[PDB]
C-alpha cells in the first residue's frame, strides 16, 4: 500500500473532493481493511467497511 | 508650500542589518513618522513560516528516534527558526531526507524554484549512526502576525493523521527597529532633520520592500480616515 | 481484580494571565496583561525589556 499509485490516486481525490461522499468498491474484505488501515495511519480518512 | 521626504540612500551593512534615511522632513514629523514606521514594521509584515510537520517513525511530539540525540521537540525548536522566502504558491511541502553521520543542517533540503532557503548552515539535527535515517515533510504557508496551534484547534479541519505534529506560527520577519531624527542642514533652510531607520530582520523582507509596504498600509488606513461622512 | 489499564496523558500549558511568577527574594505577582511588542518600552538601541 506505499507504492500501488491506485491508493496515491485515491488518496489524492478525495482530499482534493473533501466535500463529497465517495462510493468505493473492491472485491474482498481484506483488502478493504488494509484500505481503510492506509487511509487512516496516512490520512486520517474516515471509512466504515 | 510645503516639503515632503524623499527616500534616499539605503546602506546594508550585512545580509540582516540594514539602515535606512529619508532626507528632507519638516519639522516636529520626524518622531511621528519614526514611531509610525516601528510601529507598522513590528506588527503588520507578512511572512512565511513553517506549520506543522510529519516525521516518520513518530507517532507524537514526545517519543525518540534511535541513533538522535536530540528529543523532537528540540527538533520542532530547530525548525521554528527556518527563514524561508516563498515566491509563487501560500502551501509548499519540502522533503527532508538525510543518512548517516552528520549535522543534517537546512542546506540538505530538496532545492525546489519558489522556496529560497535564507541561512543554509542553519543546523537541523546530529545524526550519530551509519545506517540512521530520517525523512520528514514540512508544510510552509504565508501569514500573518502571530497564531499558535492551540487557537487553531478549533478550527482542526481534519486534522486526523496522528502522523501530523503542529507548531506555533511566528508569521512575523521582523527582529528589532531603531530610528533617530537628527539635524539635516539643508542648503537653504536652518533647522530640518533627517531621519535614519537602522532594522535587524531574518534575513527574508528586503527593507526597500518593507517600507514601501508599511507606507501603503498606513496610507491606506489613513484614506479611509480622510473621508468623514456627518451626514 | 481480573485486570488493569493504566494510560497517561501529556498536556502543554502555556502561560496566560492569572498565573502567579515569583523572583527570588519574595516578589511576587499575577501576570496581569500580555502585551504586544510595540507598546513595550524599548531603549535607544531598540531592544525591548
Redesign the interface.
Known amino acids: 500500500w506505499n507504492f500501488d499509485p491506485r491508493v496515491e490516486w485515491l488518496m489524492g481525490y478525495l482530499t482534493s473532493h ?1 466535500s463529497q461522499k465517495v462510493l468505493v468498491i473492491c472485491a474482498k474484505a481484506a483488502t478493504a481493511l488494509q484500505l481503510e488501515q492506509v487511509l ?7 471509512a466504515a467497511v | 508650500e510645503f516639503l515632503k521626504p524623499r527616500l534616499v540612500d539605503i546602506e546594508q551593512v550585512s545580509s540582516t542589518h540594514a539602515k535606512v534615511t529619508l532626507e528632507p522632513l519638516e519639522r516636529g514629523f520626524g518622531h511621528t513618522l519614526g514611531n509610525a514606521l ?2 507598522i514594521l ?2 503588520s509584515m507578512p511572512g512565511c513560516a513553517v506549520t506543522e510537520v510529519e516525521i516518520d517513525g513518530v507517532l507524537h511530539e ?1 517519543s525518540t528516534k534511535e541513533g538522535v540525540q536530540e528529543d523532537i521537540l528540540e527538533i520542532l525548536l530547530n525548525l521554528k527558526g527556518l527563514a524561508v522566502r516563498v515566491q509563487g504558491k501560500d502551501e509548499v511541502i519540502l522533503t527532508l531526507n538525510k543518512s548517516g553521520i552528520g549535522p543534517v543542517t537546512a542546506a540538505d533540503i530538496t532545492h525546489d524554484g519558489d522556496v529560497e532557503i535564507v541561512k543554509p548552515q542553519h543546523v537541523i539535527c546530529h545524526l550519530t549512526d551509519e545506517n540512521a535515517s530520517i525523512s520528514m515533510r514540512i508544510k510552509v504557508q504565508r501569514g500573518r502576525g502571530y497564531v ?1 496551534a ?1 487557537t487553531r484547534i478549533h478550527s482542526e479541519e ?6 501530523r505534529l503542529l507548531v506555533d506560527a511566528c508569521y512575523s520577519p521582523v527582529e ?3 530610528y ?1 531624527v537628527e539635524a539635516a542642514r539643508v542648503e537653504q533652510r536652518t533647522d530640518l532633520d533627517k531621519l535614519v531607520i ?1 532594522m ?1 530582520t531574518n534575513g527574508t523582507i528586503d527593507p526597500e520592500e518593507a517600507i514601501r509596504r508599511a507606507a501603503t498600509i498606513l496610507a491606506e488606513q489613513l484614506e479611509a480616515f480622510v473621508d468623514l461622512r456627518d451626514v | 481484580v481480573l485486570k488493569i489499564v493504566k494510560v497517561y496523558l ?1 498536556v502543554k500549558r ?1 502561560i496566560q494571565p492569572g498565573d502567579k511568577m515569583a523572583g527570588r527574594h519574595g516578589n511576587k505577582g499575577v501576570i496581569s496583561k500580555i502585551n ?3 507598546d513595550m518600552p ?1 531603549d ?4 525591548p525589556v
Do not use: K, V
Not at chain 1, 487512516?40 to 474516515?46: M, N, P, S
Not at chain 3, 535607544?44 to 531592544?47: A, F, H, L, R
Open positions: 473533501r487512516r495511519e496516512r490520512e486520517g480518512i474516515r | 516601528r510601529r513590528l506588527s514526545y499558535p492551540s481534519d486534522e486526523r493523521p496522528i502522523g528589532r527597529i531603531a533617530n537602522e535587524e | 501529556a502555556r504586544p511588542i510595540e524599548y535607544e538601541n531598540g531592544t
